[PDB]
Symmetry: C3
Subunit: 402 residues, 3 copies
């Protein structure tokens, strides 16, 4: 149950909400309509609960991948920017906010992995994955290593696996074909074979996780790491002279990191859809609009062309957008759960030598089908639970009857 | 159990079985073949048990929706009426007796929802749904209400939901496409939004069932109700001056009620397949044949054109047919179990405001899949039991085993 | 691991492994590369276990139907014979060693069911199924029966069932269409009906299994039996004058038995793929190669055209190939488990009179579905316990923690 003649916005606490409120303050002075910017605890799980009944905020800010599930449940309204406003943002971002052909959210910020190198240890970072083994031997003489990054989570190893033509799901016609999985094709096989080759030649360690990767780079033990903008602040605190650049190529093809997009979606239950559109399109998604948010807490790379060109003077931001443009957009579909499950197991089992690359990737298809079944069962029994609570008490109850 | 040279017929106890026996009596005098008409308890439940082993009646009379289950199991014979006989019944009725492309039964009677109105309170019934909110306000001044009908079943509320373009399944080329579902489209959405708008504007009550509606109309508390031919006899006893007319139109589109068709199938195991065709086509499905049945217990609207024009002199029977021709035929496929489960919950949660119309219809897909899963689980274990049964017991065992 | 510059082969103990070693000995003499031929217990179970981790033989010999699973798990390398070599083997055998459109093994020997007749009791065997009822009545006057074979397993009864148009799954364009199942069609109906009618007319007994069938023919109580080459040795010992000929035709159409093709597959983890191709194509798949193996233990009908013509001078081998050439290759897909489960029960129930032919075959569709859901249930929980195991190795316990 939301209000009217006013706007209420939900954005996460680690974002520039104070700056966003100042955009809402600018909105009030022009239209006379009050904007409240709330940052409630765990709004990502709160929003599906409250919007189902017709409540919650007018606008919600979150990563696009979670919006797929909101649109599935009919919680988000179809946004209607004209052709001219769509040319204002980078074309690829709009694909991240599409569900069932319809547009469901406005892209705000773009997030992806880049290659972070130590400038003092390595002044000219490698442009290819293939020249890293040769670089490791040269650094091992100085008591250092070439590259250390998280190998436990498929999110970090995917950029290399996807390089030569591996994909999560095929995206064409504006939809993801769930019968077209690209986990054990020729390109993903070569990608992961290179990773396993790096481990059995002792150029990397299969035990390396996020904490070990970060700690190593910030202490100056390793020349390179692979990480997102979320980690820049901690590297700043270590006093390490670092640079952020384009990811290394593999077989001449660029690394394809997953692209995450911070998006603004309109609650389908909102009586202020016309107002939200006016706010987002003409007050927020403008140079002056994003600037207020960015000065509170940096947005990183942004969807708006005109303002991205301005931030891109920071070479670390330019590198985020470059790797993003060369990358795969994170699929917003529910099948993505089964994907992480299968690929996490596949990478772990290949890297440990417990399974061949070929057999580990082949097992992913059967392992993801297994997860599907478990979720299918979860949904089935949750439904039966609700059904019983629906009929026993809602209708006939001991002390009334059907 | 059966023979060659005689016919045995199953028809439900609440039908005109004596009148059917009269048609069998006329059949015996012209061809010299004795026809028995039986009406056993739970014959709809018994038929699949005895027909599977090769027994049961030569002909079974039941609603067409249950015939899909019989044809799936191969208990029904493919009927062969020529083009000339197919023009004798209403074209749309043949679609009810079609499973897997082939015709499997003869259409006898047609049954559908109609608008029943109190003539004393409302001489000119509304032609549109849009004018019922305003019509309720006038009647509330006299302590009465405009419309009260069952909202607990989706069968009664579907007419409105399907009006603007909602559909259960797409029907083309004589086949249902189970991938093409229309519960979550703009048409179904608008229809259900109007139903919910009526309840929150206090024109209708969210908890109105079949009992509460029938008793209110028959006492003269409400001006209109929605119900089928099965309920007329109860209104007759109440002395209420009532009429039966076409359902109100929504957005200029007609309400589309589901159409049940009383049908006569021929057993697959029947050695009298030719005799059953002669009896059903040239003796029962004539003006004389249906008359004898109709005078024992009213058939409602009939499939045969010639005899329907005769019955349509009764304004109630003409309206049952009119609503049936404007509505969609009840699908006989097994995916219909899950459809009802999902839609029942979708409507209830929309009516009670636990879920917004958009969100309530979105969850339908999820609940239809849930019922498919735990339905598939039932067949899984049923099969496994039958297996270990014949395998372990019927076969290898202590005495002359293995 | 298997080493390099050496070749190691796995073949079942009941095949001519010594003769294969002779070919290995010849390979060693021309090229200087030693070939070991191991015959481990239960290899068909061991191979998936060891080849997954990268160990196992360089070459494995097994029936093609098990290879589809090995290819699914990516344990088999794609073989590369040129057009000129593929003409050397019977075109239909290449369809047995195909998975995902890729060739994954070399065809060695063909195995299929044949009609075996007693010469002393029946000098001229029936060419058609239709005359067998009449032929049984002539033999019951002499205290004998016309035909006795295993009716408990669908493998044996299928030839008759498939003849008029029955099929497991449609094999077109190289792939198997799972949605197109030919168990419930008119052809399979008629086949099973004839079988059921044979039992109903006391020409065969529904309780007749493999052991009863073989013992009766080997004692000389029955004129005909249906069985493969695997049983010839037992008939030889009984001193019975027997012949092996083409299966009887049903409705002028040939009986379609399932074809088993013994095959040589190269391990995907083999560092000797080039050497295995040299060995198999130029040393084994030649007149002298197969002869060496055949003299140790008869291969039956072979895949190689040249050596097959030479073997066809044996009337029994010519028939095995003839019946195989008119029959169908047994699908190498996982869905075959559920097919056997369904059809086995279908035929059992039709033979016993528990269900009509129509009702029995109709239930096979739902029974096959039930087994599939059972199977993907087994797989789901197997991957869940693997996940729980994998978690620990990564995980926290009283030896260490995250
Ligand atoms: Na709020
Ligand atoms: Na395509
Ligand atoms: Na970055
Ligand atoms: Na520009
Ligand atoms: Na070669
Ligand atoms: Na750790
Ligand atoms: Zn907070
Ligand atoms: Zn949070
Ligand atoms: Zn320097
Ligand atoms: Zn190296
Ligand atoms: Zn600026
Ligand atoms: Zn500025
Ligand atoms: Zn500003
Ligand atoms: Zn109470
Ligand atoms: Zn009887
Ligand atoms: Zn009765
Ligand atoms: Zn019904
Ligand atoms: Zn006619
Ligand atoms: Zn009103
Ligand atoms: Zn049409
Ligand atoms: Zn049409
Ligand atoms: Zn459609
Ligand atoms: Zn209420
Ligand atoms: Zn009640
Ligand atoms: Zn007559
Ligand atoms: Zn008449
Ligand atoms: Zn008349
Ligand atoms: Zn007459
Ligand atoms: Zn009359
Ligand atoms: Zn229509
Ligand atoms: Zn069902
Ligand atoms: Zn026992
Ligand atoms: Zn016992
Ligand atoms: Zn030689
Ligand atoms: Zn051995
Ligand atoms: Zn087999
Ligand atoms: Zn071919
Ligand atoms: Zn190709
Ligand atoms: Zn006979
Ligand atoms: Zn086809
Ligand atoms: Zn036995
Ligand atoms: Zn040679
Ligand atoms: Zn063929
Ligand atoms: Zn440790």
């Amino acid at each position: 149950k939301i209000e009217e003649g006013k706007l209420v916005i939900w954005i996460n606490g680690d974002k520039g909400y104070n700056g966003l409120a100042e955009v809402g303050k600018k909105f009030e002075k022009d239209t006379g309509i009050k904007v409240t910017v709330e940052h409630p605890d765990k709004l990502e799980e709160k929003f599906p609960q409250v919007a189902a009944t017709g409540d919650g905020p007018d606008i919600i800010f979150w990563a696009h991948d979670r919006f797929g599930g909101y649109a599935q449940s009919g919680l988000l309204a179809e946004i209607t920017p004209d052709k001219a406003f769509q040319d204002k943002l980078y074309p690829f971002t709009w694909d991240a906010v599409r569900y069932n052909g319809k547009l469901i959210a406005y892209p705000i910020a773009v997030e992806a992995l880049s290659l972070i190198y130590n400038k003092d240890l390595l002044p000219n970072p490698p442009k290819t994955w293939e020249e890293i083994p040769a670089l490791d031997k040269e650094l091992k003489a100085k008591g250092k290593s070439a590259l250390m990054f998280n190998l436990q989570e498929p999110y970090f190893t995917w950029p290399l696996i996807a390089a030569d033509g591996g994909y999560a799901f095929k995206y064409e016609n504006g939809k993801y074909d769930i019968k077209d999985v690209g986990v054990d094709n020729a390109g993903a096989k070569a990608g992961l074979t290179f990773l396993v080759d790096l481990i059995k030649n002792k150029h990397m360690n299969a035990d390396t996780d996020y904490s070990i990767a970060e700690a190593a780079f910030n202490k100056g033990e390793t020349a390179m790491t692979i990480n997102g903008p979320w980690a820049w602040s901690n590297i700043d605190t270590s006093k390490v002279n670092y640079g952020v650049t384009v990811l290394p190529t593999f077989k001449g093809q660029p690394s394809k990191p997953f692209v995450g997009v911070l998006s603004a979606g309109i609650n389908a239950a909102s009586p202020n859809k016309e107002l939200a559109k006016e706010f987002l399109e003409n007050y927020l998604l403008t140079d002056e609009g994003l600037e207020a948010v960015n000065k509170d807490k940096p947005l990183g790379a942004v969807a708006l062309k005109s303002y991205e060109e301005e931030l891109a003077k920071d070479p670390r931001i330019a590198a985020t957008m470059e790797n993003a443009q060369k990358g795969e957009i994170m699929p917003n579909i529910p099948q993505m759960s089964a994907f992480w499950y299968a690929v996490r197991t596949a990478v772990i089992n290949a890297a440990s030598g417990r399974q061949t690359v070929d057999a580990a990737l082949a097992a992913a298809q059967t392992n993801a089908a297994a997860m599907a079944t478990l979720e299918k069962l979860m949904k089935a029994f949750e439904s039966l639970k609700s059904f019983q609570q629906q009929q026993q008490q809602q209708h006939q109850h001991q002390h009334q009857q059907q």
